[PDB]
Each structure stands twice: as C-alpha cells, then as structure tokens.
C-alpha cells in the first residue's frame, strides 16, 4: 500500500503424496487423488519435504524431442512386425480351409 | 489362434499412442510425459498368450525453469504440488503456474480452478498453519485505521 | 511405492528383502526375509554417549602470564572450542573446552556449558594429560563430562576421548577432527538404493 | 489413430501462426506480443488423447516510449487503457496513442 | 500510470526471441508430421494387407 | 457490423487443416473398400459351395 | 535438446541488452552502471541444463561532480539518497540533483 505497511493475505499450501504414479490426469493438466496414492498431506513451501518456489518462473514440459523421435521409428517397426504375424496366420489358415 | 497376435497390435498401438501424446503436448508448462509399461500373460501351459498393458507411468522429474516475468506465476523445483478447488468443491492437483485475477478478484488459472491456501486471520493479520485451506483473494477494500498501543 | 509405503512392482506383488533391526538398525543375513517398507515416522532424539576429538599441540608456546584460570580472559587459557552435543531431548549443548599450560609438556583441560548459563564457570582443572618425551600420549584420554539440565530435560553424560594426540611443533593450534554420536531428531526426506542392494534413506 | 497426432499437428500450426503474426506485428505501435498455452487430454483409459490449445495468452509489459513530436500523441506508463466507442456505440479499450 | 505527451508505445516484440521459437516450432512440426506419417504408414500397411 | 473501404474478405480456408483432413478421409475411404471385398469373398464361397 | 542452447542465447541477449543500455545512459546525471550475473541449472541428472540470469547488479560508485552554476541543484558525495514522493503516494529514491 501507500502507507509503507506490509500485510499478508495467505500462503501457498503444498501437498506431497506418499505415493506418486497414482494421480489420474483428468480433463486439463490437473491430477485427482484416489486410493493407492495416500492422503493429500498438506504443508507449507518452506519446511518439510516441500521445496522452495520461485516467482516469475515456470516449469518446462520435461520432454526430449530426440528421445521421442528415435522411439517413434522403433515403435513403427514393431507395429509393422506384428502385422506380419497376422498375415502369416491368414495364409496358414487359408490353405487348411481350402484343403 | 490370433489371440496372442492381435494382442500385440493393441499394445503396439497403445505404445504408439503414448509416444504421440508426449510429442503432441510439447512446450506445455504443466505437462508430465508418460511411459508405457507392458506385461506378458501365461494362463495355459508353456505357451505365451500375448501381452498386457500395466498402465502408463508419468515422469515426475522436474523440467527446466523459464523466466517469463509477471507476478501471477510460480515454479516448483522439487517435490511438492499445488492444491486447487472447483465450483462443486472437489480437490485437484496440478503444477501449472499460470494464474489470473477474474472480475471476482480470485487467484484462478486459465481453466477456472480456485487456488487454495491458509487464510490470514487476526489483528494484525497473520497466517496460521493450523487452519483449513481457503481460496486466496485480493480484496479492493482498504484496511481500517490502527490505534497505537506499543511504541 | 504402495498406498501404505510398501515397495511393490506394477502388478501389486509385494517385494521382499532383508528385515532391518537394531539401534541403529542393521541388516541380518540369516533372518527370515520380510517385505520391505519405507515408513515416514520421524526418529526421536538420540542421546550423546561417545565423542572423540584430536587436537594438535605446539612445543614453543609460552606459559600463560596470568596464572589464575579465567573464562572471560583470552590469555588465561590457550585453546577454546565449541563442542556440539545433544541430550535425550535433542537440545543443542555447546561445550567450551579450555586448554591451559602449567609446566613443560603438561596441559590442564576444563569443561564449560555454554547453552546453560545456570552452570558454574570452571575454575578447577577437570583432568590432567601428561605427554611423554616423544609427544605420544599413553593413558588418561577417557574423561566423563556431564551436561546441564534446562527446561525439564535430563542431563546427558558422555565419555570424551583424547586418543591419538601429538605434541610435535605444528606452529599454531588448529582443529581438524570433531564428531559426536548423538543427533537431534529428524524427519525422512528422500530414499535411494545402493549398488550393494541395501536401501538408504536421507 | 490420428487423434493422438493430428490434433497436436494442428496445435503445432497454431504455435507457428501466433509467432508469424508477432513477426508481422513487429512494426505496429500498440501491439502486445502473444504466445499459446496447451493442455493434454485423458479418456477413461490412462492413455493420452493428444493435445488441444488451452488458449492464446498475451503479454502486458510496457514497451519503449518512442518520441515522435506530434501534439496529439500520448503514451501510458503503467496499468491503463484508453476507451473508445464506435458509430454503433460499442465500448472498446486500447493503448494505441495515435490520435487525429 | 502517467501519460507522456508526444510519445508512442513500442511493438513489445524482440525479433531475436521469435527467430528461434520459429525454428523450434518448425522442427516440432516435422516431428508431428513424421508421427502422422507413421500413422498414415501404419494404416497403409494394414489396409493393403 | 462496420464496413471498410478498399478492402476485401478472404476465403477463410487453411491448407494446414485441409491436408490432414484429406489424409484421414482417404484412409476411411480405403478402409470401407475392404468391407466390400470381404463381403464379396464371403459370398463367393457360398455360391460356389 | 535446444534447452541449453536457447537458454544461453537468452542470457547472451540479456547481457548485450545490459551493455547497450549502459552505453545509451552515458549522459544522465544520476545513472549507475548495471551488469549481468548468471548461473547454471542442474536437475537430478548429472548433465547441465543451461544458464539463467542470476540478476542485474547496479554499481554504486560515485562519479565526478560537474559544476553548472545553478543554485537549485546539489550532488551527494557519499552514501545517501534523495527521498521523493509523487502524486498519490509511494516513496522513491534518487540521486539526480536537477531540481525544478
């Protein structure tokens, strides 16, 4: 304010779960708690197991384009490789039915 | 006799689907890429009956911080998420730092989630850590004059 | 991890491992294997029982001119240090140990409690250490030192060891080795598995 | 299917388009730069559905006050907007300090 | 805020920043296309089979 | 709404959206062709006994 | 990926911006030289992630003392700042001595 006075309206609460990988993403980029994830376990950003924040900063997407591109090629070949089994199973059954 | 063969296609498609999802959501700040997890099956006798999907596991490891400025945006560098509430009252968790003030003057993200925190109560105002979380709002009202008691 | 802090694979099959028992807990090679868990319960205060400290001494240090022992006088003693010890309640007790020289190759050690001002400042020598001609100590290194009681906390008793001490001229007094076996209560932060297979938590 | 990819492809195009406009708008006087924000989707299964643009966001920092020397030119310094009305009578708010 | 007379707002854009965002967005675009290429490719093998 | 002299309205078509939609439509068209072929063979066996 | 390289790009652009601003401000009567300071990132892995801008540091050495001859103007010789209040409120601090 203009009176050289500092006031607080609240603090950011942080919730770290006893088990990760149990947060089912719903709708937008948010996660909803459930069983096999634990209680919310609220807390403050200063102490505990909750880390420090940084105003004016944002987290990236934590993805690697190089890793995904090469995995794309491997995934396609595996997907075509299984198709050969279907084609083989088709011919191997066609000869038997037609005797 | 296609049961084992067709099961591979579903897993291959599912694996390809997750890879596509990760690259489709690039540059999203509150994004956490997943990973496929498979599992074989054996119900008969020494004959593989195909594959299974055990669920997708996200990579909770933090990304790279970026300096976008503003004041309605914060980042997390290690363990710890945010708690958000909706109109009905359900509790949602996310790591998005994008915030804005609406006409109701509430700390809201771009979707409509109300940021929650410990309310500041008492005279002088202070934050108590034993209270139930409440939405954080910034009122336009001015504080009342204070009677001097201690100098 | 499971809902109740249990190591488990993706299919819900509970992991097994060596049960951990002891104070501090260790690994029993012959014990019956049991599921491994990572509870978040906080460890309580650990009482100080064993302490060690090695101090290098100088052979050309003159005898103090002000013979009577004083706690607030710099030259009344030679060396002062802060010894961090903990009681059964985790409170931090810093001990002021004073070194003073009375004759050749002989030192008198004092103990003072700084975290507790109610304690009396030391004036009489606690114990004596006599170094041999070559400067290698032979006996007398184990001394029992007791803390002060504050805020309803029981006093802590620990045995201080002056083992492995030397007297050759090193120029100036310096501290290189200090440790305590008692630590304040703490909370679990993070856990990891080593290449040997054990689980170690920070 | 294409859903996991084509949507993101569209998203990518938008991410490019919002850049191109900023490249084109590099000479206007009252512009504010804009970026995009995205969000993933999830069906009943734990497999992603793709990505949709969460929305276009605009930055509202202050640019340099270029001096021109015209009498009827004004520039804001902090939070604020000029207010304008049309022939029909709608209300609009802006920051362009070009007046005649 | 104050109203400076005779001054005009800038374009609020710094070309150095978007000249590289454009490149990274492009590379993302061909990555997507390779996906969608793979999607077309996959569907292609199965349909002709 | 208002008008503007010396200007015209564009065609509001994006080749980015149409090309990806054309690929999807073609496969859908390719796919249904399989059903006709499948229904053709499934009937050919029956008539030939 | 590009993260390290783009972060370095941004840091270098910021430092060039600071240098250019210092060059431009070579005539104002109360300026203080500004410099950049950086730091790197390291995640849970061992490979580096890039560089931030740890912040901008102003220099607070006292410059020379020009004599202009006017009466309504002063210059501080050591630590200390003029305290000013505009319009509504707020307490700003300055060192320029040109007083209207």
Q: Is G89 on the interface with A (CB under 8 A)?
A: yes
Strand A10-15 and strand E3-5: the pairing is unpaired
Q: How far is D7 from chain F (nearest CA, A)?
A: 10
Is residue G78 within 8 A of residue G60, CB to CB? The reply is no
Q: Helix, strand, or coil here: D93?
A: strand
Element containing residue G24 per DSSP (H, E): helix G3-24
Q: How far is E17 from chain G (nearest CA, A)?
A: 8
Structure tokens at B129: 């850590």
Q: Which residue in G has a C-alpha nearest to residue B77's C-alpha?
A: G43
Taking the C-alpha atoms of residue G28 and residue G11, their distance in angstroms, rounded to an integer, is 26
Taking the C-alpha atoms of residue A50 and residue A53, their distance in angstroms, rounded to an integer, is 9
User: What letters, b where the CB count within 10 A reaches 16 and e where it falls short, cover B109-121?
Assistant: bbbebbbbbbbbe
Is residue C94 within 8 A of residue C82, CB to CB? The reply is yes
Q: Residue C88: name the closest of C12, C146, C36, C164 by CA.
A: C146
Taking the C-alpha atoms of residue G55 and residue C187, their distance in angstroms, rounded to an integer, is 34
Interface chains of chain E (3 or more CB pairs under 8 Å): A, B, D, F, G
Taking the C-alpha atoms of residue B15 and residue B32, their distance in angstroms, rounded to an integer, is 16
Q: Do D39 and A25 touch (CB under 8 A)?
A: no
A and C touch with 3+ CB pairs <8 Å, answer yes
| CA F47 and chain centroid, separation | 34
**Chain E residues lying within 8 Å of B24, measured CB to CB:** 32
Of A24, A28, A29, the CB nearest to D46: A24
Q: How far is G89 from chain A (nearest CA, A)?
A: 5
**C145 Cβ partners below 8 Å, 6+ apart?**
C95, C111, C126, C157, C158, C159, C160
- The beta-strand segments (E) located in G1-100 are 34-42, 48-58, 82-84, 92-94
Question: First vs last Cα of chain B: how many Å apart?
Answer: 90
* Upper half-sphere CA count for residue B132 (Cβ side, 13 Å): 0
Q: How far is E23 from chain G (nearest CA, A)?
A: 10
Taking the C-alpha atoms of residue C95 and residue C83, their distance in angstroms, rounded to an integer, is 5
Taking the C-alpha atoms of residue C44 and residue C47, their distance in angstroms, rounded to an integer, is 10
Residues 31-70 of chain A with CB under 8 A from chain G are: 60, 64-66
Interface chains of chain G (3 or more CB pairs under 8 Å): A, B, E
User: What letters, b where the CB count within 10 A reaches 16 and e where it falls short, cover B68-103?
Assistant: bebeebbbbbebbbbbbbeeeeeebbbbbbbbeeee
Instruction: Write out the DSSP string of chain C.
Output: --TTSB-B-TTSPBP-B--EEETTEEE-SSSPPB--B---PPB------EEEEEEB--SSPPPPSS-S--SS-STTSSEEEEEEEE-TT--EEEEEEEEEEEETTEEEEEEEESS-TTSPPP-S--EEEEB-TTS-B-S--EEEEE----TTPPP-EEEEE--S-B-S--SS--EEEEEES----B----EEE-TTS-EEE-
| CA B36 and chain centroid, separation | 20
Q: Do E16 and G13 touch (CB under 8 A)?
A: yes
Q: Do D50 and B20 touch (CB under 8 A)?
A: yes
**Chain G residues lying within 8 Å of A4, measured CB to CB:** 91
* Upper half-sphere CA count for residue B51 (Cβ side, 13 Å): 18
Taking the C-alpha atoms of residue B96 and residue C122, their distance in angstroms, rounded to an integer, is 60
Is residue B19 within 8 A of residue A69, CB to CB? The reply is no
**A17 Cβ partners below 8 Å, 6+ apart?**
A23, A33, A37, A38, A39, A40, A41
CA distances from B127 to B124, C63, C201 (A): 10, 58, 32
Q: Which residue in A has a C-alpha nearest to residue E27's C-alpha?
A: A65
Q: How far is B20 from chain E (nearest CA, A)?
A: 7
Q: Do B23 and E38 touch (CB under 8 A)?
A: no
Neighbours of C36 (CB within 10 A): 16
Taking the C-alpha atoms of residue F38 and residue A79, their distance in angstroms, rounded to an integer, is 23
Of E34, E38, E45, the CB nearest to A83: E45
Backbone angles phi, psi at C43, to 5 degrees: -80, 140
DSSP-assigned beta bridge partners for residue C6 = C37
Q: Residue B26: name the closest of E31, D46, D42 by CA.
A: E31
10 Å CB burial of residue B135 (0-12, 13-18, 19+) is middle
Of B16, B23, B27, the CB nearest to E32: B23
Taking the C-alpha atoms of residue D60 and residue D70, their distance in angstroms, rounded to an integer, is 25
Taking the C-alpha atoms of residue G36 and residue G8, their distance in angstroms, rounded to an integer, is 13
DSSP class of residue D88 equals S
Neighbours of A33 (CB within 10 A): 19
10 Å CB burial of residue D10 (0-12, 13-18, 19+) is buried
Q: Do A2 and G89 touch (CB under 8 A)?
A: yes
Question: First vs last Cα of chain A: how many Å apart?
Answer: 92
DSSP-assigned beta bridge partners for residue A26 = A30
DSSP class of residue G98 equals B
Structure tokens at G55: 């912040």
Instruction: Write out the DSSP string of F1-49.
Output: ----TT--------HHHHHHHHHHHHHHHHHHHHHHHHHHHHHHHHHH-
Q: Which residue in G has a C-alpha nearest to residue E27's C-alpha?
A: G2
Taking the C-alpha atoms of residue C80 and residue C110, their distance in angstroms, rounded to an integer, is 10
**Chain E residues lying within 8 Å of A68, measured CB to CB:** 31
Neighbours of E34 (CB within 10 A): 18
What is the helix, strand, coil percentage profile of chain A, to 5? 35, 20, 45
Taking the C-alpha atoms of residue B110 and residue B89, their distance in angstroms, rounded to an integer, is 18
Q: How far is D21 from chain F (nearest CA, A)?
A: 15
**Chain A residues lying within 8 Å of B137, measured CB to CB:** 9
User: What letters, b where the CB count within 10 A reaches 16 and e where it falls short, cover C124-145?
Assistant: eebbebebeeeeebeeebebeb
User: What letters, b where the CB count within 10 A reaches 16 and e where it falls short, cover B4-19?
Assistant: bbebbbebbbbbbbbb
Q: Helix, strand, or coil here: E48?
A: helix
Backbone angles phi, psi at D98, to 5 degrees: -100, 115
Structure tokens at C50: 């064993």
**Chain F residues lying within 8 Å of E44, measured CB to CB:** 27
**Chain G residues lying within 8 Å of B61, measured CB to CB:** 43-44
**Chain F residues lying within 8 Å of E43, measured CB to CB:** 27, 30
Interface chains of chain C (3 or more CB pairs under 8 Å): A, B
DSSP-assigned beta bridge partners for residue G9 = none
Question: First vs last Cα of chain D: how many Å apart?
Answer: 56
Neighbours of C168 (CB within 10 A): 11
Q: Is B42 on the interface with A (CB under 8 A)?
A: no
**Chain D residues lying within 8 Å of B17, measured CB to CB:** 4, 47-48
Residue with tokens 């309504």: G72
Q: Do F17 and D88 touch (CB under 8 A)?
A: no
* Determination technique for this entry: cryo-EM
Q: Helix, strand, or coil here: A15?
A: strand
Q: Do B110 and D55 touch (CB under 8 A)?
A: yes
Is residue B52 within 8 A of residue B39, CB to CB? The reply is yes
**Chain C residues lying within 8 Å of A22, measured CB to CB:** 3
Q: Do G43 and B61 touch (CB under 8 A)?
A: yes
Is residue E46 within 8 A of residue B5, CB to CB? The reply is no
Is residue C166 within 8 A of residue C55, CB to CB? The reply is no
C and F touch with 3+ CB pairs <8 Å, answer no
Q: Is the dihedral of CA A53, A54, A57, A60 positive or negative?
A: negative
Q: How far is C12 from chain B (nearest CA, A)?
A: 10
Taking the C-alpha atoms of residue C12 and residue B146, their distance in angstroms, rounded to an integer, is 61
Q: Helix, strand, or coil here: A81?
A: helix
DSSP class of residue D73 equals B
Q: How far is E18 from chain A (nearest CA, A)?
A: 17
Q: Do E24 and G2 touch (CB under 8 A)?
A: yes
Taking the C-alpha atoms of residue F30 and residue G2, their distance in angstroms, rounded to an integer, is 40
Taking the C-alpha atoms of residue D11 and residue C41, their distance in angstroms, rounded to an integer, is 47
How many residues are recorded in chain F? 49
C177: left (phi over 0), alpha (psi -120 to 50) or beta: beta
**D44 Cβ partners below 8 Å, 6+ apart?**
none
Interface chains of chain D (3 or more CB pairs under 8 Å): A, B, E, F
Backbone angles phi, psi at G36, to 5 degrees: -95, 160
Taking the C-alpha atoms of residue F31 and residue F21, their distance in angstroms, rounded to an integer, is 15
Q: Do B138 and A9 touch (CB under 8 A)?
A: yes
User: What letters, b where the CB count within 10 A reaches 16 and e where it falls short, cover C62-91?
Assistant: eebeeeebeeeeeebbbbeeebbbbbbbbb
Structure tokens at C185: 């209560």
Instruction: For an interface test with D, give the residue of E2, E10, E37 to mutate (most D CBs within 10 A).
Output: E10
Q: Please, which contacts does G2-9 make with residues 24 or more away whose CB atoms are closer than 8 Å? A: G2/A65, G2/E20, G2/E24, G3/A60, G3/B64, G3/G49, G3/G50, G4/G48, G4/G49, G4/G50, G5/G50, G6/E20, G6/E24, G6/G50, G7/B64, G7/G41, G7/G49, G7/G50, G7/G51, G7/G52, G8/G50, G8/G51, G9/E16, G9/E20
DSSP-assigned beta bridge partners for residue B65 = A59
Q: Do A58 and B98 touch (CB under 8 A)?
A: yes
Taking the C-alpha atoms of residue B86 and residue A19, their distance in angstroms, rounded to an integer, is 24
Backbone angles phi, psi at G76, to 5 degrees: -85, 140
Structure tokens at D62: 């202050």
Strand D74-76 and strand E3-5: the pairing is antiparallel
Of D8, D65, D78, the CB nearest to E7: D65
10 Å CB burial of residue A17 (0-12, 13-18, 19+) is buried
Is residue D30 within 8 A of residue D97, CB to CB? The reply is yes
Q: Which residue in G has a C-alpha nearest to residue B66's C-alpha?
A: G52
Q: Which residue in G has a C-alpha nearest to residue A66's C-alpha?
A: G1
């Amino acid at each position: 304010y203009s009176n050289e006075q500092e006031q607080v309206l609240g603090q950011i609460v942080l919730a770290n779960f006893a088990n990760n990988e149990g947060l089912a993403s719903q709708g937008d980029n948010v996660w909803a708690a459930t069983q096999a994830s634990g209680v919310a376990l609220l807390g403050t950003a200063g102490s505990g197991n909750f880390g420090k924040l940084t105003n004016g900063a944002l987290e990236a997407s934590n993805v690697d384009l190089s890793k995904e591109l090469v995995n794309m090629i491997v995934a396609q070949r595996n997907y075509q490789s299984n198709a050969q089994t279907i084609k083989t199973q088709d011919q191997i059954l066609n000869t038997l039915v037609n005797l | 006799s296609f049961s084992q063969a067709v099961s591979g296609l579903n897993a291959a498609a599912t694996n390809l689907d997750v890879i596509g999802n990760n690259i489709a959501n690039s540059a999203t700040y509150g994004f956490k890429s997943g990973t496929a997890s498979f599992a074989d099956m054996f119900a008969g006798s020494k004959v593989g009956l195909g594959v299974k999907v055990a669920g997708i596991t996200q990579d909770f490891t933090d990304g790279t911080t970026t300096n976008t400025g503003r004041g309605l945006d914060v980042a997390i560098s290690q363990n710890g998420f945010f708690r958000l509430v909706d109109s009905n009252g359900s509790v949602f968790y996310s790591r998005n730092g994008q915030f804005k003030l609406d006409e109701n003057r509430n700390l809201v993200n771009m979707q409509g989630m109300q940021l929650t925190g410990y309310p500041a109560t008492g005279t002088p105002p202070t934050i108590q850590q034993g209270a139930n979380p409440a939405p954080i709002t910034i009122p336009n009202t001015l504080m009342a004059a204070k009677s001097t008691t201690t100098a | 991890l499971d809902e109740n802090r249990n190591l488990v694979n993706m299919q819900g099959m509970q992991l097994t491992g060596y049960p951990a028992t002891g104070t501090p807990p260790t690994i029993q090679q012959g014990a019956n294997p049991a599921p491994i868990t990572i509870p978040n319960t906080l460890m309580a205060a650990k009482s100080t029982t064993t302490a060690s400290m090695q101090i290098n001494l100088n052979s050309t240090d003159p005898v103090p001119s002000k013979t009577p022992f004083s706690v607030s006088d710099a030259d009344s003693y030679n060396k002062k240090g802060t010894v961090t010890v903990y009681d059964s309640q985790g409170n931090a007790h810093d001990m002021n140990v004073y070194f003073v020289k009375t004759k050749d190759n002989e030192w008198a050690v004092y103990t003072h409690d700084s975290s507790d001002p109610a304690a009396t400042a030391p004036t009489t020598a606690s114990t004596t250490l006599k170094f041999n001609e070559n400067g290698i100590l032979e006996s007398g290194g184990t001394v029992n030192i007791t803390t002060g009681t504050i805020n309803g906390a029981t006093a802590a008793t620990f045995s201080l060891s002056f083992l492995n001490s030397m007297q050759q001229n090193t120029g100036a007094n310096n501290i290189v080795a200090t440790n305590q076996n008692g630590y304040k209560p703490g909370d679990l932060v993070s856990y990891q598995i080593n290449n040997d297979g054990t689980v170690v938590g920070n």
